[PDB]
Design an enzyme around this catalytic site. Structure first.
Site, PDB file in Angstrom:
ATOM      1  N   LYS B 109     -42.032  22.966  14.122  1.00 18.77           N
ATOM      2  CA  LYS B 109     -43.668  22.944  14.075  1.00 18.77           C
ATOM      3  C   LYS B 109     -44.237  23.585  15.179  1.00 18.77           C
ATOM      4  N   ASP B 233     -52.203   7.459  17.388  1.00 20.81           N
ATOM      5  CA  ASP B 233     -52.630   8.466  16.196  1.00 20.81           C
ATOM      6  C   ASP B 233     -51.303   8.914  15.442  1.00 20.81           C
TER       7      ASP B 233
END
Ligand SMILES: Nc1nc2c(ncn2[C@@H]2O[C@H](COP(=O)(O)OP(=O)(O)NP(=O)(O)O)[C@@H](O)[C@H]2O)c(=O)[nH]1
Ligand SMILES: Nc1nc2c(ncn2[C@@H]2O[C@H](COP(=O)(O)OP(=O)(O)NP(=O)(O)O)[C@@H](O)[C@H]2O)c(=O)[nH]1
Ligand SMILES: Nc1nc2c(ncn2[C@@H]2O[C@H](COP(=O)(O)OP(=O)(O)NP(=O)(O)O)[C@@H](O)[C@H]2O)c(=O)[nH]1
Lengths: 316, 301
Positions: B109, B233
């Site tokens: 990523k 988050d």
């Protein structure tokens, strides 16, 4: 399998790292059908800046440059040197002695000047063609690699050649012969060293002769004429013939002496400049003879002629 | 012969760099322990070729690997051999930045300068947690971290073990947090359904009492650690593979040592399924969120 690159100097560690790295990279690069012109202007460059990592033997900061790697790989190939063997000889253990030999005595590593590197570039296309048309049968230096190392912001140029001498048979005398009309003899300083580098007049005063018999001597002289013609046609001078004398009986004694606490046989595929003495010669000996110091850009035709005459007269 | 042929030069440099750093590491002895400097360390290499080896690689590029000793130890503690990791990245170009290696074992990523900074802030603690839970965890398993410079543009990447199986196709996907999916995303082939979609669909995951307990124990431990590090988050990634649809060399068969997040469906489940579940997206910097997350994640067995 682990290569620590431990060496008594950081420059030697970087050399070992560099040969390992370039040969590994090359193993991912296909072998071309032919060389292209760009291969003669090409280079590979690496710059390492590690930080708090892998600092035991390498510097943290260094650079490594390999000149015309496709060409020198082709050269290695045409000289019968496998790349895996070449990297093993440089990296398995640190080279020893600037003038170095690989730990196994197979290859010589000489530090050179910027000028030499330029001169090698100027001669590379012609030198390569000479190697292809003489099928690697030459007395000239066999160039296997050429590198620039940067450690401590300092550049060091190096050229790797196959050793003129045997990697196993001991050399007992050596001469550096040029043929100069000018007097060339060895210093009392050099003459006190373990293996003095005797010059031409030392050879002449001794009445030294090298008896190799007709067949080997013909092959040698044919190589010599072709080689110095090549050097003349490139406007090159100041080169020498390196001569090393191996005494078989002396070696047998030295070996039996280390043992208390084949003889004169060698592999020509490896010791490519070696010749046995003639069947009917006084002592049984092995000779190693090659041209060296060919990187320096008074007359080169005349140098060719005088050199070839003097070296013609050191055989029987 | 590793050509490093890739669909973009950046994937070529990634393949080259992973090959290079792993080969160098095989020449670096395995330490008795990690040292503090190992958590501040990096390797940096800069390549400038000229008329040479330009068929697949750029001629000029840079490659930086953060904390190579740490990430090598993480790979070890995660049961991943270095040569296998190298092979997954280099034998064939990674695919679809969000990439997987050609064999789908690892996820690559692209991340931000900030994310790399945050991983530096958490790395010593994350490593300590990994040694203290023996790698038995639902958090992302970080295997490497790299900065690539090609055409003077820096790109940061983190390599993780895939949450999903590298072989079994996953047929539905949910991203759960607790506190919906777009008509756009709901039109994609495999939508990322969010928590309210999961609640509206009445989807449930029946793994039985035995498996559900240990899973909840790990989930609580992980999210308590994340809170104690003040991270928020993050999400739980859930993927569902339905064996019968695959039927339309065995069905529903997997190696737990490889697909480490995989769980079989319970006998008393309507359809026979495989579930993949792990925590993801833990890199952008309360406790209350830990608690509420663990609550939403408790009631799916
Ligand atoms: N004829 C020829 N000479 C070359 C070639 N490449 C390098 N040289 C010469 O080799 C010598 C040393 O090379 P090098 O140190 O690599 O030069 P550089 O590119 O200036 N490097 P730097 O700026 O970092 O010091 C120089 O005198 C240079 O002119 C080439 O392809 N052909
Ligand atoms: N074993 C071995 N020795 C070599 C070889 N080439 C040169 N030498 C030896 O190494 C030394 C350097 O050789 P050379 O290339 O002529 O260097 P130089 O700069 O002209 N002479 P100097 O010794 O003053 O530096 C000499 O003592 C020479 O005999 C080789 O291939 N093998
Ligand atoms: N196959 C696979 N897919 C994953 C994995 N982790 C994440 N993904 C998928 O790739 C997406 C990447 O987005 P993500 O990192 O979650 O970032 P986000 O900000 O939460 N969502 P987005 O950027 O798409 O708006 C995830 O939403 C999920 O669909 C993994 O391990 N394997």
């Amino acid at each position: 399998k682990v290569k620590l690159f431990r060496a008594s100097e950081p420059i030697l560690s970087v050399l070992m790292w560099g040969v390992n790295h370039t040969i590994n990279e090359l193993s991912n690069v296909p072998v071309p059908v032919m060389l292209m012109p760009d291969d003669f202007k090409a280079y590979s460059k690496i710059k390492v800046d590690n930080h708090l990592f892998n600092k035991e033997n390498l510097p943290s900061r260094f650079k490594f440059k390999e000149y015309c790697p496709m060409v020198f790989r082709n050269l290695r190939e045409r000289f019968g040197i496998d790349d895996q063997d070449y990297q093993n000889s440089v990296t398995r253990s640190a080279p020893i002695n600037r003038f170095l030999t690989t730990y196994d005595r197979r290859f010589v590593i000489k530090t050179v000047s910027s000028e030499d590197v330029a001169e090698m570039h100027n001669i590379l296309k012609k030198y390569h063609q000479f190697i292809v048309e003489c099928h690697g049968n030459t007395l000239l230096p066999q160039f296997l690699g050429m590198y620039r190392l940067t450690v401590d912001g300092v550049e060091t140029y190096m050229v790797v050649t196959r050793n003129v001498f045997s990697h196993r048979l001991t050399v007992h005398r050596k001469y550096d012969l040029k043929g100069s009309t000018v007097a060339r003899e060895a210093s009392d300083k050099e003459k006190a060293k373990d293996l003095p580098t005797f010059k031409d007049n030392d050879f002449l005063n001794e009445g030294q002769k090298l008896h190799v018999g007709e067949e080997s001597k013909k092959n040698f002289l044919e190589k010599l004429k072709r080689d110095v013609e090549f050097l003349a046609q490139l406007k090159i001078m100041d080169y020498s013939l390196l001569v090393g004398i191996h005494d078989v009986d002396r070696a047998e004694q030295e070996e039996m002496e280390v043992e208390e606490r084949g003889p004169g046989e060698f592999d020509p595929s490896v010791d490519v400049y070696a010749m046995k003495s003639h069947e009917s010669s006084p002592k049984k000996e092995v000779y190693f003879m090659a041209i060296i110091d060919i990187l320096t850009p008074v007359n080169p035709e005349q140098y060719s002629k005088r050199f070839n005459e003097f070296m013609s007269n050191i055989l029987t």
